[PDB]
Write a protein that holds these residues in place. Structure first.
Motif, PDB file in Angstrom:
ATOM      1  N   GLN A  26       0.795  -1.235   0.000  1.00  0.00           N
ATOM      2  CA  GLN A  26       0.000   0.000   0.000  1.00  0.00           C
ATOM      3  C   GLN A  26       0.823   1.279   0.000  1.00  0.00           C
ATOM      4  OE1 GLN A  26      -3.338   0.566  -0.198  1.00  0.00           O
ATOM      5  NE2 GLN A  26      -4.123  -1.563  -0.083  1.00  0.00           N
ATOM      6  N   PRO A  27       0.355   2.279  -0.735  1.00  0.00           N
ATOM      7  CA  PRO A  27       0.912   3.637  -0.672  1.00  0.00           C
ATOM      8  C   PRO A  27       0.594   4.331   0.658  1.00  0.00           C
ATOM      9  CG  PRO A  27      -1.166   3.718  -1.776  1.00  0.00           C
ATOM     10  CD  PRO A  27      -0.786   2.224  -1.656  1.00  0.00           C
ATOM     11  N   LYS A  28       1.439   5.273   1.079  1.00  0.00           N
ATOM     12  CA  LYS A  28       1.191   6.093   2.269  1.00  0.00           C
ATOM     13  C   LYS A  28       1.367   7.571   1.913  1.00  0.00           C
ATOM     14  CE  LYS A  28       0.199   5.733   6.631  1.00  0.00           C
ATOM     15  NZ  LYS A  28      -0.239   4.608   7.550  1.00  0.00           N
ATOM     16  N   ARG A  29       0.321   8.367   2.110  1.00  0.00           N
ATOM     17  CA  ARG A  29       0.433   9.830   2.126  1.00  0.00           C
ATOM     18  C   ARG A  29       0.769  10.374   3.517  1.00  0.00           C
ATOM     19  NH1 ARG A  29      -1.328  13.666  -0.181  1.00  0.00           N
ATOM     20  NH2 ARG A  29      -3.449  14.416   0.379  1.00  0.00           N
ATOM     21  N   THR A  30       1.607  11.385   3.599  1.00  0.00           N
ATOM     22  CA  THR A  30       1.865  12.062   4.873  1.00  0.00           C
ATOM     23  C   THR A  30       1.842  13.560   4.729  1.00  0.00           C
ATOM     24  OG1 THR A  30       3.278  10.260   5.533  1.00  0.00           O
ATOM     25  CG2 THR A  30       3.508  12.252   6.725  1.00  0.00           C
ATOM     26  N   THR A  31       1.271  14.233   5.714  1.00  0.00           N
ATOM     27  CA  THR A  31       1.205  15.693   5.757  1.00  0.00           C
ATOM     28  C   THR A  31       1.984  16.364   6.914  1.00  0.00           C
ATOM     29  OG1 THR A  31      -0.795  15.686   4.500  1.00  0.00           O
ATOM     30  CG2 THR A  31      -0.438  17.554   5.879  1.00  0.00           C
ATOM     31  N   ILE A  32       2.059  17.695   6.904  1.00  0.00           N
ATOM     32  CA  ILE A  32       2.556  18.472   8.040  1.00  0.00           C
ATOM     33  C   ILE A  32       2.180  19.929   7.833  1.00  0.00           C
ATOM     34  CG2 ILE A  32       4.610  19.393   9.191  1.00  0.00           C
ATOM     35  CD1 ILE A  32       5.882  16.856   9.250  1.00  0.00           C
ATOM     36  N   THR A  33       1.249  20.435   8.639  1.00  0.00           N
ATOM     37  CA  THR A  33       1.086  21.886   8.764  1.00  0.00           C
ATOM     38  C   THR A  33       2.140  22.483   9.694  1.00  0.00           C
ATOM     39  OG1 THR A  33      -1.225  22.290   8.127  1.00  0.00           O
ATOM     40  CG2 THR A  33      -0.419  23.708   9.776  1.00  0.00           C
ATOM     41  N   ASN A  34       2.427  23.761   9.463  1.00  0.00           N
ATOM     42  CA  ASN A  34       2.558  24.747  10.532  1.00  0.00           C
ATOM     43  C   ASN A  34       1.810  26.039  10.127  1.00  0.00           C
ATOM     44  OD1 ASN A  34       5.765  23.405  10.264  1.00  0.00           O
ATOM     45  ND2 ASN A  34       4.454  22.869  12.002  1.00  0.00           N
ATOM     46  N   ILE A  42       4.405  11.377  -0.752  1.00  0.00           N
ATOM     47  CA  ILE A  42       3.787  10.137  -1.119  1.00  0.00           C
ATOM     48  C   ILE A  42       4.888   9.104  -1.082  1.00  0.00           C
ATOM     49  CG2 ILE A  42       4.131  10.761  -3.521  1.00  0.00           C
ATOM     50  CD1 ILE A  42       1.451   8.438  -2.191  1.00  0.00           C
ATOM     51  N   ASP A  43       4.589   8.023  -0.373  1.00  0.00           N
ATOM     52  CA  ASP A  43       5.476   6.880  -0.237  1.00  0.00           C
ATOM     53  C   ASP A  43       4.792   5.742  -0.964  1.00  0.00           C
ATOM     54  OD1 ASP A  43       6.801   4.497   0.624  1.00  0.00           O
ATOM     55  OD2 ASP A  43       7.209   5.244   2.505  1.00  0.00           O
ATOM     56  N   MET A  44       5.424   5.170  -1.979  1.00  0.00           N
ATOM     57  CA  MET A  44       4.756   4.173  -2.797  1.00  0.00           C
ATOM     58  C   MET A  44       5.677   3.155  -3.434  1.00  0.00           C
ATOM     59  SD  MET A  44       3.556   6.452  -6.085  1.00  0.00           S
ATOM     60  CE  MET A  44       2.818   5.063  -6.914  1.00  0.00           C
TER      61      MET A  44
ATOM     62  N   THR B  38      13.734  -7.556  -7.837  1.00  0.00           N
ATOM     63  CA  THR B  38      14.171  -6.323  -7.179  1.00  0.00           C
ATOM     64  C   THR B  38      13.051  -5.271  -7.163  1.00  0.00           C
ATOM     65  OG1 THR B  38      16.551  -6.655  -7.644  1.00  0.00           O
ATOM     66  CG2 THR B  38      15.896  -4.397  -7.251  1.00  0.00           C
ATOM     67  N   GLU B  39      12.663  -4.882  -5.944  1.00  0.00           N
ATOM     68  CA  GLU B  39      11.480  -4.064  -5.710  1.00  0.00           C
ATOM     69  C   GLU B  39      11.721  -2.854  -4.773  1.00  0.00           C
ATOM     70  OE1 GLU B  39       7.806  -6.276  -4.964  1.00  0.00           O
ATOM     71  OE2 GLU B  39       7.964  -7.296  -6.876  1.00  0.00           O
ATOM     72  N   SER B  40      11.186  -1.711  -5.192  1.00  0.00           N
ATOM     73  CA  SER B  40      11.575  -0.419  -4.688  1.00  0.00           C
ATOM     74  C   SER B  40      10.339   0.320  -4.279  1.00  0.00           C
ATOM     75  CB  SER B  40      12.239   0.427  -5.791  1.00  0.00           C
ATOM     76  OG  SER B  40      13.572   0.026  -5.999  1.00  0.00           O
ATOM     77  N   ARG B  41      10.533   1.186  -3.293  1.00  0.00           N
ATOM     78  CA  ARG B  41       9.615   2.252  -3.045  1.00  0.00           C
ATOM     79  C   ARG B  41      10.255   3.601  -3.274  1.00  0.00           C
ATOM     80  NH1 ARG B  41       5.055   0.313  -0.333  1.00  0.00           N
ATOM     81  NH2 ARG B  41       4.480   2.358   0.532  1.00  0.00           N
ATOM     82  N   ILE B  42       9.420   4.581  -3.593  1.00  0.00           N
ATOM     83  CA  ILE B  42       9.890   5.944  -3.648  1.00  0.00           C
ATOM     84  C   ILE B  42       9.091   6.808  -2.649  1.00  0.00           C
ATOM     85  CG2 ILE B  42       8.506   6.486  -5.692  1.00  0.00           C
ATOM     86  CD1 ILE B  42      11.985   7.972  -5.488  1.00  0.00           C
ATOM     87  N   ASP B  43       9.785   7.568  -1.792  1.00  0.00           N
ATOM     88  CA  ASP B  43       9.119   8.477  -0.871  1.00  0.00           C
ATOM     89  C   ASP B  43       9.503   9.881  -1.363  1.00  0.00           C
ATOM     90  OD1 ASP B  43       8.128   9.877   1.396  1.00  0.00           O
ATOM     91  OD2 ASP B  43       9.814   9.509   2.638  1.00  0.00           O
TER      92      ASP B  43
END
Ligand SMILES: [Zn+2]
Ligand SMILES: [Zn+2]
Lengths: 205, 205
Positions: A26-34, A42-44, B38-43
Protein backbone atom coordinates in the motif's frame (compact mmCIF):
# COMPACT_ATOMS: atom_id res chain seq x y z
CA UNK A 1 -16.57 15.38 -33.55
CA UNK A 2 -12.78 15.67 -32.71
CA UNK A 3 -10.07 13.94 -30.70
CA UNK A 4 -10.95 11.57 -27.89
CA UNK A 5 -8.45 11.02 -25.17
CA UNK A 6 -8.78 8.08 -22.81
CA UNK A 7 -7.07 7.92 -19.48
CA UNK A 8 -6.24 4.27 -18.73
CA UNK A 9 -4.55 4.75 -15.41
CA UNK A 10 -5.59 3.46 -12.04
CA UNK A 11 -5.97 5.96 -9.20
CA UNK A 12 -3.59 5.80 -6.31
CA UNK A 13 -4.87 5.88 -2.72
CA UNK A 14 -4.50 4.05 0.61
CA UNK A 15 -6.63 0.93 0.37
CA UNK A 16 -6.33 0.60 -3.40
CA UNK A 17 -5.96 -2.80 -4.95
CA UNK A 18 -2.43 -4.08 -4.60
CA UNK A 19 -0.59 -7.28 -5.54
CA UNK A 20 -1.75 -10.37 -3.64
CA UNK A 21 -3.61 -7.96 -1.30
CA UNK A 22 -0.24 -7.61 0.64
CA UNK A 23 -0.72 -4.64 2.99
CA UNK A 24 2.99 -3.70 2.78
CA UNK A 25 2.37 -2.90 -0.92
CA UNK A 26 0.00 0.00 0.00
CA UNK A 27 0.91 3.64 -0.67
CA UNK A 28 1.19 6.09 2.27
CA UNK A 29 0.43 9.83 2.13
CA UNK A 30 1.87 12.06 4.87
CA UNK A 31 1.20 15.69 5.76
CA UNK A 32 2.56 18.47 8.04
CA UNK A 33 1.09 21.89 8.76
CA UNK A 34 2.56 24.75 10.53
CA UNK A 35 1.74 27.95 8.58
CA UNK A 36 0.90 28.86 4.96
CA UNK A 37 1.83 26.24 2.23
CA UNK A 38 0.99 22.52 1.69
CA UNK A 39 3.79 20.09 2.70
CA UNK A 40 2.85 16.41 1.85
CA UNK A 41 4.71 13.36 0.56
CA UNK A 42 3.79 10.14 -1.12
CA UNK A 43 5.48 6.88 -0.24
CA UNK A 44 4.76 4.17 -2.80
CA UNK A 45 5.82 0.95 -4.40
CA UNK A 46 7.07 1.64 -7.92
CA UNK A 47 4.98 -1.30 -9.12
CA UNK A 48 1.86 0.32 -7.79
CA UNK A 49 -1.14 0.58 -10.06
CA UNK A 50 -0.48 1.48 -13.63
CA UNK A 51 3.26 1.31 -14.22
CA UNK A 52 6.07 0.51 -16.54
CA UNK A 53 8.57 -2.18 -15.84
CA UNK A 54 12.30 -1.62 -15.91
CA UNK A 55 14.44 -4.75 -16.80
CA UNK A 56 16.13 -4.35 -13.30
CA UNK A 57 12.91 -5.75 -11.86
CA UNK A 58 13.57 -9.42 -12.84
CA UNK A 59 17.27 -9.10 -13.85
CA UNK A 60 20.24 -8.79 -11.44
CA UNK A 61 22.29 -5.71 -12.42
CA UNK A 62 19.56 -5.22 -15.08
CA UNK A 63 18.79 -2.12 -17.16
CA UNK A 64 17.25 0.62 -15.05
CA UNK A 65 14.27 3.03 -15.62
CA UNK A 66 15.72 6.30 -17.26
CA UNK A 67 17.17 3.79 -19.72
CA UNK A 68 13.66 3.31 -21.18
CA UNK A 69 13.50 5.65 -24.15
CA UNK A 70 10.57 7.90 -24.04
CA UNK A 71 10.34 7.56 -27.79
CA UNK A 72 9.01 3.99 -27.55
CA UNK A 73 6.42 5.04 -25.00
CA UNK A 74 4.94 7.57 -27.37
CA UNK A 75 3.38 6.66 -30.67
CA UNK A 76 0.93 4.33 -32.36
CA UNK A 77 -0.26 1.22 -30.60
CA UNK A 78 -2.86 -1.46 -31.10
CA UNK A 79 -5.47 -2.42 -28.53
CA UNK A 80 -6.91 -5.88 -28.86
CA UNK A 81 -10.01 -7.28 -27.31
CA UNK A 82 -9.22 -10.47 -25.42
CA UNK A 83 -12.10 -10.35 -22.96
CA UNK A 84 -13.47 -13.72 -24.03
CA UNK A 85 -10.30 -15.44 -22.86
CA UNK A 86 -10.10 -17.42 -19.62
CA UNK A 87 -7.18 -18.06 -17.29
CA UNK A 88 -4.47 -16.72 -19.57
CA UNK A 89 -3.56 -15.46 -23.05
CA UNK A 90 -1.86 -18.18 -25.11
CA UNK A 91 -0.06 -18.10 -28.43
CA UNK A 92 -3.16 -19.55 -30.07
CA UNK A 93 -5.24 -16.68 -28.65
CA UNK A 94 -3.19 -14.03 -30.44
CA UNK A 95 -1.48 -15.65 -33.42
CA UNK A 96 -4.17 -14.77 -35.89
CA UNK A 97 -4.02 -11.03 -34.97
CA UNK A 98 -2.31 -8.23 -36.87
CA UNK A 99 0.82 -7.91 -34.76
CA UNK A 100 4.19 -6.86 -36.22
CA UNK A 101 7.78 -5.85 -35.61
CA UNK A 102 7.84 -2.49 -33.83
CA UNK A 103 4.24 -2.55 -32.59
CA UNK A 104 3.12 -1.57 -29.13
CA UNK A 105 0.30 -3.98 -28.32
CA UNK A 106 -2.21 -3.66 -25.50
CA UNK A 107 -4.47 -6.46 -24.26
CA UNK A 108 -7.88 -5.77 -22.73
CA UNK A 109 -9.08 -8.71 -20.67
CA UNK A 110 -11.56 -9.64 -18.03
CA UNK A 111 -9.12 -7.94 -15.67
CA UNK A 112 -10.33 -4.49 -16.76
CA UNK A 113 -13.81 -5.33 -15.57
CA UNK A 114 -12.76 -6.20 -12.05
CA UNK A 115 -11.99 -3.50 -9.47
CA UNK A 116 -10.40 -5.55 -6.68
CA UNK A 117 -7.33 -7.67 -6.97
CA UNK A 118 -7.98 -11.27 -8.10
CA UNK A 119 -5.32 -13.96 -7.71
CA UNK A 120 -6.39 -15.69 -10.88
CA UNK A 121 -5.92 -12.67 -13.15
CA UNK A 122 -5.71 -13.16 -16.89
CA UNK A 123 -1.98 -13.15 -17.76
CA UNK A 124 0.31 -13.49 -20.75
CA UNK A 125 1.54 -17.02 -21.05
CA UNK A 126 5.01 -18.02 -21.91
CA UNK A 127 4.20 -19.30 -25.39
CA UNK A 128 2.55 -15.95 -26.09
CA UNK A 129 5.48 -14.01 -24.75
CA UNK A 130 7.84 -16.03 -27.00
CA UNK A 131 5.65 -15.47 -30.03
CA UNK A 132 5.62 -11.75 -29.22
CA UNK A 133 9.37 -11.57 -28.67
CA UNK A 134 10.16 -13.49 -31.79
CA UNK A 135 7.84 -11.04 -33.57
CA UNK A 136 9.93 -8.26 -32.05
CA UNK A 137 7.16 -5.93 -30.96
CA UNK A 138 8.48 -2.88 -29.08
CA UNK A 139 5.99 -2.99 -26.21
CA UNK A 140 3.28 -4.91 -24.50
CA UNK A 141 0.65 -3.82 -22.09
CA UNK A 142 -1.72 -5.67 -19.83
CA UNK A 143 -4.53 -4.76 -17.50
CA UNK A 144 -3.43 -6.77 -14.49
CA UNK A 145 -1.04 -5.54 -11.80
CA UNK A 146 1.36 -8.20 -13.02
CA UNK A 147 1.76 -9.67 -16.51
CA UNK A 148 2.63 -13.14 -15.26
CA UNK A 149 1.63 -15.73 -12.59
CA UNK A 150 1.80 -19.51 -12.09
CA UNK A 151 5.00 -19.80 -14.09
CA UNK A 152 8.01 -20.90 -12.07
CA UNK A 153 11.04 -18.65 -12.82
CA UNK A 154 9.01 -15.75 -14.24
CA UNK A 155 9.72 -16.78 -17.88
CA UNK A 156 7.23 -14.41 -19.51
CA UNK A 157 9.05 -11.36 -18.04
CA UNK A 158 12.43 -12.61 -19.05
CA UNK A 159 11.50 -13.72 -22.55
CA UNK A 160 10.29 -10.14 -23.00
CA UNK A 161 13.16 -8.36 -21.30
CA UNK A 162 15.67 -10.38 -23.27
CA UNK A 163 14.05 -9.29 -26.49
CA UNK A 164 13.91 -5.60 -25.53
CA UNK A 165 10.14 -5.34 -25.07
CA UNK A 166 8.78 -2.81 -22.70
CA UNK A 167 6.08 -3.96 -20.34
CA UNK A 168 3.20 -1.89 -19.07
CA UNK A 169 1.16 -3.32 -16.28
CA UNK A 170 -1.91 -2.22 -14.34
CA UNK A 171 -3.76 -0.64 -17.25
CA UNK A 172 -7.47 0.06 -17.05
CA UNK A 173 -9.05 -0.54 -20.41
CA UNK A 174 -12.81 -1.20 -19.82
CA UNK A 175 -13.92 2.03 -21.51
CA UNK A 176 -11.75 1.90 -24.57
CA UNK A 177 -12.99 0.44 -27.85
CA UNK A 178 -10.67 -2.04 -29.62
CA UNK A 179 -8.53 -0.52 -32.35
CA UNK A 180 -5.64 1.85 -33.09
CA UNK A 181 -4.53 4.66 -30.79
CA UNK A 182 -1.68 7.07 -30.36
CA UNK A 183 -0.31 6.29 -26.89
CA UNK A 184 1.39 8.59 -24.44
CA UNK A 185 2.59 6.48 -21.67
CA UNK A 186 4.23 9.06 -19.40
CA UNK A 187 6.05 7.79 -16.30
CA UNK A 188 7.63 9.68 -13.45
CA UNK A 189 11.14 10.40 -14.48
CA UNK A 190 12.77 8.18 -11.91
CA UNK A 191 16.44 7.60 -12.11
CA UNK A 192 17.94 4.22 -11.38
CA UNK A 193 14.73 2.33 -10.69
CA UNK A 194 13.03 -1.00 -11.26
CA UNK A 195 9.87 0.62 -12.66
CA UNK A 196 7.86 3.68 -12.34
CA UNK A 197 4.31 4.73 -11.96
CA UNK A 198 2.96 5.88 -15.25
CA UNK A 199 0.14 8.07 -16.39
CA UNK A 200 -1.05 6.45 -19.60
CA UNK A 201 -3.31 8.05 -22.21
CA UNK A 202 -4.68 6.87 -25.52
CA UNK A 203 -5.65 9.31 -28.21
CA UNK A 204 -7.80 8.23 -31.10
CA UNK A 205 -5.72 10.93 -32.99
CA UNK B 1 7.28 16.63 -41.87
CA UNK B 2 7.74 14.25 -38.78
CA UNK B 3 6.74 14.86 -35.14
CA UNK B 4 9.23 15.90 -32.43
CA UNK B 5 8.54 15.25 -28.78
CA UNK B 6 10.32 17.40 -26.28
CA UNK B 7 10.66 16.07 -22.72
CA UNK B 8 10.57 19.06 -20.45
CA UNK B 9 10.68 17.30 -17.14
CA UNK B 10 13.45 17.13 -14.54
CA UNK B 11 14.75 13.80 -13.37
CA UNK B 12 14.09 12.65 -9.84
CA UNK B 13 16.98 11.31 -7.68
CA UNK B 14 18.44 11.71 -4.16
CA UNK B 15 20.73 14.75 -4.39
CA UNK B 16 18.61 16.57 -6.97
CA UNK B 17 17.84 20.32 -6.84
CA UNK B 18 15.01 21.04 -4.43
CA UNK B 19 13.41 24.26 -3.20
CA UNK B 20 15.83 26.24 -1.10
CA UNK B 21 18.17 23.24 -0.98
CA UNK B 22 16.32 21.92 2.05
CA UNK B 23 17.34 18.27 2.73
CA UNK B 24 13.85 17.44 4.06
CA UNK B 25 12.72 17.95 0.44
CA UNK B 26 14.76 15.19 -1.10
CA UNK B 27 13.15 11.99 -2.31
CA UNK B 28 14.36 8.61 -0.78
CA UNK B 29 14.40 5.36 -2.70
CA UNK B 30 14.47 2.18 -0.70
CA UNK B 31 14.93 -1.28 -2.19
CA UNK B 32 14.62 -4.93 -1.22
CA UNK B 33 15.99 -7.89 -3.25
CA UNK B 34 14.72 -11.48 -3.40
CA UNK B 35 16.95 -13.53 -5.68
CA UNK B 36 16.28 -12.39 -9.27
CA UNK B 37 13.54 -9.97 -8.10
CA UNK B 38 14.17 -6.32 -7.18
CA UNK B 39 11.48 -4.06 -5.71
CA UNK B 40 11.58 -0.42 -4.69
CA UNK B 41 9.62 2.25 -3.05
CA UNK B 42 9.89 5.94 -3.65
CA UNK B 43 9.12 8.48 -0.87
CA UNK B 44 8.84 12.01 -2.34
CA UNK B 45 7.47 15.47 -1.83
CA UNK B 46 4.46 16.04 -4.05
CA UNK B 47 6.18 19.26 -5.18
CA UNK B 48 9.35 17.53 -6.35
CA UNK B 49 10.95 18.65 -9.58
CA UNK B 50 8.48 19.07 -12.34
CA UNK B 51 5.06 19.29 -10.78
CA UNK B 52 1.56 20.62 -10.94
CA UNK B 53 -0.20 22.81 -8.42
CA UNK B 54 -3.93 23.21 -8.98
CA UNK B 55 -6.62 25.22 -7.32
CA UNK B 56 -7.98 23.38 -4.32
CA UNK B 57 -11.54 23.39 -5.69
CA UNK B 58 -10.48 20.94 -8.36
CA UNK B 59 -10.10 18.17 -5.74
CA UNK B 60 -13.26 18.58 -3.99
CA UNK B 61 -14.31 17.82 -0.42
CA UNK B 62 -12.73 14.70 1.09
CA UNK B 63 -10.58 12.58 -1.09
CA UNK B 64 -13.41 10.91 -3.15
CA UNK B 65 -11.58 9.30 -6.03
CA UNK B 66 -10.86 12.83 -7.21
CA UNK B 67 -7.57 13.76 -8.94
CA UNK B 68 -6.28 16.77 -10.76
CA UNK B 69 -8.27 16.83 -13.97
CA UNK B 70 -6.59 16.65 -17.36
CA UNK B 71 -8.86 18.77 -19.58
CA UNK B 72 -6.34 21.59 -19.66
CA UNK B 73 -3.12 19.74 -18.91
CA UNK B 74 -3.59 17.99 -22.23
CA UNK B 75 -3.79 20.23 -25.24
CA UNK B 76 -2.39 23.19 -27.12
CA UNK B 77 -0.08 25.65 -25.42
CA UNK B 78 2.09 28.65 -26.21
CA UNK B 79 5.69 28.83 -25.22
CA UNK B 80 7.37 32.27 -25.02
CA UNK B 81 11.06 33.07 -24.89
CA UNK B 82 11.50 35.44 -21.94
CA UNK B 83 15.18 34.71 -21.45
CA UNK B 84 15.95 38.43 -21.69
CA UNK B 85 14.01 39.08 -18.48
CA UNK B 86 16.00 39.88 -15.31
CA UNK B 87 14.81 39.25 -11.69
CA UNK B 88 11.12 38.70 -12.51
CA UNK B 89 8.43 38.73 -15.17
CA UNK B 90 6.16 41.75 -14.88
CA UNK B 91 2.99 42.89 -16.54
CA UNK B 92 5.09 44.96 -18.93
CA UNK B 93 7.17 41.97 -19.90
CA UNK B 94 4.09 40.09 -21.25
CA UNK B 95 1.23 42.50 -22.03
CA UNK B 96 2.14 42.74 -25.68
CA UNK B 97 2.29 38.91 -26.13
CA UNK B 98 -0.48 36.93 -27.84
CA UNK B 99 -2.11 35.52 -24.71
CA UNK B 100 -5.81 34.74 -24.57
CA UNK B 101 -8.63 33.48 -22.44
CA UNK B 102 -8.28 29.70 -22.31
CA UNK B 103 -4.59 29.54 -23.16
CA UNK B 104 -1.99 27.56 -21.38
CA UNK B 105 1.25 29.54 -21.51
CA UNK B 106 4.80 28.44 -20.67
CA UNK B 107 7.63 30.87 -19.88
CA UNK B 108 11.17 29.98 -20.85
CA UNK B 109 13.52 32.12 -18.80
CA UNK B 110 17.07 32.27 -17.56
CA UNK B 111 16.08 29.56 -15.04
CA UNK B 112 16.15 27.02 -17.88
CA UNK B 113 19.86 27.66 -18.24
CA UNK B 114 20.76 26.86 -14.63
CA UNK B 115 20.82 23.25 -13.38
CA UNK B 116 21.16 23.92 -9.64
CA UNK B 117 18.72 25.59 -7.35
CA UNK B 118 19.21 29.35 -7.35
CA UNK B 119 17.51 31.51 -4.70
CA UNK B 120 16.95 34.49 -7.01
CA UNK B 121 15.11 32.67 -9.69
CA UNK B 122 13.09 34.39 -12.30
CA UNK B 123 9.53 34.38 -11.05
CA UNK B 124 6.02 35.67 -11.99
CA UNK B 125 5.33 38.96 -10.09
CA UNK B 126 1.98 39.95 -8.66
CA UNK B 127 1.11 42.34 -11.47
CA UNK B 128 1.80 39.82 -14.17
CA UNK B 129 -0.13 37.15 -12.30
CA UNK B 130 -3.11 39.43 -11.99
CA UNK B 131 -2.92 40.29 -15.65
CA UNK B 132 -3.03 36.59 -16.47
CA UNK B 133 -5.68 35.62 -13.89
CA UNK B 134 -7.93 38.39 -15.08
CA UNK B 135 -7.38 37.24 -18.62
CA UNK B 136 -8.66 33.84 -17.52
CA UNK B 137 -5.96 31.70 -19.07
CA UNK B 138 -6.32 28.03 -18.12
CA UNK B 139 -2.67 27.45 -17.19
CA UNK B 140 0.78 28.88 -16.65
CA UNK B 141 4.09 27.07 -16.54
CA UNK B 142 7.41 28.27 -15.28
CA UNK B 143 10.91 26.74 -15.34
CA UNK B 144 11.91 27.26 -11.70
CA UNK B 145 10.72 25.02 -8.83
CA UNK B 146 8.56 27.88 -7.69
CA UNK B 147 6.63 30.47 -9.64
CA UNK B 148 6.83 33.04 -6.82
CA UNK B 149 9.22 34.58 -4.27
CA UNK B 150 9.82 37.86 -2.38
CA UNK B 151 6.07 38.47 -2.20
CA UNK B 152 4.63 38.23 1.28
CA UNK B 153 1.37 36.33 1.35
CA UNK B 154 1.90 34.66 -2.06
CA UNK B 155 -0.36 36.98 -4.05
CA UNK B 156 0.83 35.37 -7.21
CA UNK B 157 -0.42 31.95 -6.34
CA UNK B 158 -3.57 33.35 -4.68
CA UNK B 159 -4.68 35.36 -7.62
CA UNK B 160 -4.03 32.62 -10.16
CA UNK B 161 -5.96 30.09 -8.07
CA UNK B 162 -8.97 32.36 -7.52
CA UNK B 163 -9.27 32.48 -11.27
CA UNK B 164 -8.92 28.74 -11.61
CA UNK B 165 -5.53 28.73 -13.27
CA UNK B 166 -3.32 25.65 -13.00
CA UNK B 167 0.32 26.11 -12.26
CA UNK B 168 3.17 23.97 -13.48
CA UNK B 169 6.53 24.40 -11.90
CA UNK B 170 9.95 22.86 -12.47
CA UNK B 171 9.74 22.84 -16.26
CA UNK B 172 12.99 22.35 -18.25
CA UNK B 173 12.70 24.45 -21.35
CA UNK B 174 16.33 25.06 -22.38
CA UNK B 175 16.03 23.06 -25.59
CA UNK B 176 12.63 24.22 -26.74
CA UNK B 177 12.02 26.96 -29.34
CA UNK B 178 9.42 29.68 -28.96
CA UNK B 179 6.13 28.60 -30.50
CA UNK B 180 3.04 26.47 -30.23
CA UNK B 181 2.97 22.94 -28.92
CA UNK B 182 0.57 20.21 -28.07
CA UNK B 183 1.31 19.58 -24.38
CA UNK B 184 0.76 16.48 -22.38
CA UNK B 185 1.28 17.30 -18.77
CA UNK B 186 0.66 13.96 -17.10
CA UNK B 187 0.51 13.96 -13.27
CA UNK B 188 0.82 11.07 -10.88
CA UNK B 189 -2.74 9.98 -10.39
CA UNK B 190 -2.77 10.54 -6.67
CA UNK B 191 -6.24 10.84 -5.24
CA UNK B 192 -7.22 13.94 -3.24
CA UNK B 193 -4.04 15.97 -3.65
CA UNK B 194 -3.94 19.42 -5.26
CA UNK B 195 -0.34 18.98 -6.16
CA UNK B 196 1.62 16.19 -7.80
CA UNK B 197 4.74 15.27 -9.64
CA UNK B 198 4.27 15.15 -13.37
CA UNK B 199 5.83 14.06 -16.60
CA UNK B 200 5.51 16.89 -19.09
CA UNK B 201 5.96 16.46 -22.86
CA UNK B 202 5.63 18.96 -25.72
CA UNK B 203 4.82 17.81 -29.25
CA UNK B 204 5.25 20.21 -32.26
CA UNK B 205 2.17 18.42 -33.71
ZN1 LIG C 1 5.65 -6.96 -13.19
ZN1 LIG D 1 3.18 26.02 -6.22
Amino acid sequence: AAMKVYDVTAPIYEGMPVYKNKPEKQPKRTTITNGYVTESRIDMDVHTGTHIDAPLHMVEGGATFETIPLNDLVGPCKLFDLTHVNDRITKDDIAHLDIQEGDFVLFKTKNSFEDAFHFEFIFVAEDAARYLADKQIRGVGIDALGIERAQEGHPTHKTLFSAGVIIIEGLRLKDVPEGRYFMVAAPLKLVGTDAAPARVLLFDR
